[PDB]
């Protein structure tokens, strides 16, 4: 099978700027390459096929080039409707897709505000403790969340989810949930979430003591 590798994973740009997306094939696909655009919750849309032919109804600012193993999609002047995920696809040998490049709206840096929530007494009585850490309204997307329980670093027992860029302010927010049994939760006192982000000069930790809330 022909593997398509797209780069960069994420491209952070502003309206008006030129965007250049790459797609590399593990072996020649001649000119049998297409590009697609996909927004959240929507089907993909064909932009370019046979490496350089623009589809009907696609704006002229989109153009494709390349042959063999290296391909480029260029947007000469990015516009707001172009922030989306872009995929390449080949039909030289069966049908494979790249793993996508997200074109996101650049804005200024905003460090996250950090908030921690204890498990509720109601949940505890039922047998489980969820501890939640919130990273609110930050940009860029990269951040690290570390959980510590009685000063010991946790792993394997948390899950994260992140919002899409906010429609008004283009920030992200992130939730991390740490899950323990009630028995394990009552073995420890201090529950802490430690957050790093390029906007923060030092890590921000928020913590509470079990049974002080």
């Amino acid at each position: 099978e022909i593997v398509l590798t797209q780069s960069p994973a994420t491209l952070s740009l502003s309206p008006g700027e030129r965007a250049t997306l790459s797609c590399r094939a593990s072996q020649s696909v001649s000119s049998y390459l297409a590009w697609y655009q996909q927004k959240p919750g929507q089907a993909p849309r064909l932009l370019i096929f046979d490496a350089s032919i623009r589809a009907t109804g696609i704006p002229a600012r989109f153009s494709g080039s390349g042959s063999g193993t290296d391909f480029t999609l260029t947007i000469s002047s990015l516009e707001p409707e172009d922030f989306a995920v872009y995929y390449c696809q080949q039909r030289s040998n069966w049908y494979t897709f790249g793993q996508g490049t997200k074109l996101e709206i650049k804005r200024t840096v905003a460090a996250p505000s950090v908030f921690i929530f204890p498990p509720s007494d109601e949940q505890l009585k039922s047998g489980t403790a969820s501890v939640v850490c919130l990273l609110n309204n930050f940009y860029p997307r990269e951040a690290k969340v570390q959980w510590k329980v009685d000063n010991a670093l946790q792993s394997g027992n948390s899950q994260e989810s992140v919002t899409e860029q906010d429609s008004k302010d283009s920030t992200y927010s992130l939730s991390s949930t740490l899950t323990l049994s009630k028995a394990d939760y009552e073995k420890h006192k201090v529950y802490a979430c430690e957050v790093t982000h390029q906007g923060l000069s030092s890590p921000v930790t928020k913590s509470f003591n079990r049974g002080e809330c």
Partner: peptide, 24 residues
């Protein structure tokens, strides 16, 4: 199961507090 995410000093940053609900 719906549980409160209770606000406290540990969910305040500046003059802003966060609160919420966990929907599990």
């Amino acid at each position: 199961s719906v549980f409160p995410l209770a606000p406290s000093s540990k969910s305040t940053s500046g003059g802003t507090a966060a609160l919420g609900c966990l929907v599990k």
